[PDB]
């Protein structure tokens, strides 16, 4: 069915000037952009956004990086969007993306496992949580 | 447990200059205001916000009224907030509120069944939906 | 003529539960609230908002305090609003406000010179800058 | 000197899927994107945004079109940004743009005089007004 998912273009991809190319990719893939904004996570908000990983070893690095500069979030809508967007961005490790998914966003714009260009919701539950964290219903148009 | 709920001060109460008194009441009742903003529903958004009532006879009147002027929404947090806030605002019919709940918000500031001063989420499920409709996680502070 | 000015309710007054009473005061004084929101200054933003005082000795304390917790900003509209609102809030030193302007907001809710409850634009030029810093034209309704 | 200007990607360019390519163009031209969001003008807001043209014959058509669907606004920052961005988008009539400025945004993505893909501030004064209309200082990051 038609679904909504969240992507966030990370500070590394922002700095590389990849924003337009990244959005264009999702447009060409046939998604509708339903919400879009540039903003900046505070460390606290980034921590809340990533609450599920608070126990993980990479947590602090992730929170700091994701609050180190402005990011751009978008709500993408389309058939099977959550699963399809995951596949489009590719594996978390940018280097591995270049090895196994050479057309993926992370292969094209990601540097490594931390500076990997982009985030996307990994499940229906996480999509619901993440979209609401960033955008209100008033912002979805 | 500690809960969050949504209130919206409606155009009638806004015009009456009741906004400060209404917020003060919830403050005195011991709630934390976690989010707050003045905005205006488009007819479309008001329709979406009230989707559950699309079948009801009052629907069009409600949507028009709720988009007829600016409103103010707040997220209220506190122990048992959802049920407590419902009780504080009182029955939907302002006139009946004056009869059976004379200290309720609707008794004090409501006019009738339509111009009844204020909205509050009526359940945990509707609270979750309504809060996200109006406020993002970024706006809850 | 009819003017617009900005107020911000500071963290001290927020913690005291004074928000509703403060807004009510301005409503009773005959002002229209044209915009309203709860948000939180980052230290960087608070610094920008107060750029004119960057040279002053109190600057760092002010910036830290104003980013120490959530605040609420409102746009107030009315005849001669800028000068009238200044007079309603009273002198910067809360203690002095109690001595020379006992009905002022700062006399009622302020503690001292730093925790002085509320901010208001001090001139037409600063009003224009401050309103735009906090609210877009899209948020003025 | 370094300046800020506003662009708005119009509903026609949005529908053509041109958003990514348009932003990428400005990135390649060496501008920083300081703010970005997808939103929708109400007819009233579009009218306010375009107040200078209220007397013009095209006014009503412009207001309706610009409120006919979601748009995307960005703040662009760079040396001589206001003048440079004007030149990049090209003449208002998309067809004339293809004739005299074949590399301009409007030549590439515009259809005619009304569906001409994109708006940009035409002067320092209008830039100041337009940026503030769409984005608060809190949204510029």
Swiss-Prot record, chains A, B, C, D:
CDD domains: NDPk_I. GO terms for cellular component: cytoplasm. Homotetramer. The keyword Metal-binding applies. Belongs to the NDK family. It comes from the Bacteria. ATP binds at residues 10, 58, 86, 92, 106, 116. Its main location: cytoplasm. Its cofactor is Mg(2+). The active site is at residue 119. This is Nucleoside diphosphate kinase. Its EC number is 2.7.4.6. PANTHER family: NUCLEOSIDE DIPHOSPHATE KINASE (PTHR46161), NUCLEOSIDE DIPHOSPHATE KINASE DDB_G0292928-RELATED (PTHR46161:SF3). It catalyses: a 2'-deoxyribonucleoside 5'-diphosphate + ATP = a 2'-deoxyribonucleoside 5'-triphosphate + ADP; a ribonucleoside 5'-diphosphate + ATP = a ribonucleoside 5'-triphosphate + ADP. Major role in the synthesis of nucleoside triphosphates other than ATP. The ATP gamma phosphate is transferred to the NDP beta phosphate via a ping-pong mechanism, using a phosphorylated active-site intermediate. One of its GO terms (biological process) is pyrimidine nucleotide metabolic process. It is found in: Cytoplasm. GO terms for molecular function: ATP binding; metal ion binding; nucleoside diphosphate kinase activity. Keywords: ATP-binding, Cytoplasm, Kinase, Magnesium, Metal-binding, Nucleotide metabolism, Nucleotide-binding, Phosphoprotein, Transferase. InterPro entries: NDK-like_dom, NDK-like_dom_sf, Nucleoside_diP_kinase, Nucleoside_diP_kinase_AS.
């Amino acid at each position: 069915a038609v679904e909504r998912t969240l992507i966030i273009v990370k500070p590394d991809a922002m700095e590389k000037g990849a924003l337009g190319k990244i959005l264009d990719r999702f447009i060409q893939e046939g998604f509708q952009i339903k919400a879009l904004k540039m903003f900046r996570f505070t460390p606290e908000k980034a921590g809340e956004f990533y609450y599920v990983h608070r126990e993980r070893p990479f947590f602090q690095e992730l929170v700091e990086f994701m609050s180190s500069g402005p990011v751009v979030a978008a709500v993408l809508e389309g058939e099977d969007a959550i699963k399809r967007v995951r596949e489009i961005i590719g594996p978390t490790d940018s280097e591995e993306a270049r090895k196994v998914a050479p057309n993926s966003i992370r292969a094209q714009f990601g540097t490594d496992k931390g500076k990997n260009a982009i985030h996307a919701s990994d499940s229906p539950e996480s999509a619901q949580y993440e979209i609401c964290f960033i955008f209100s219903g008033l912002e979805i148009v």
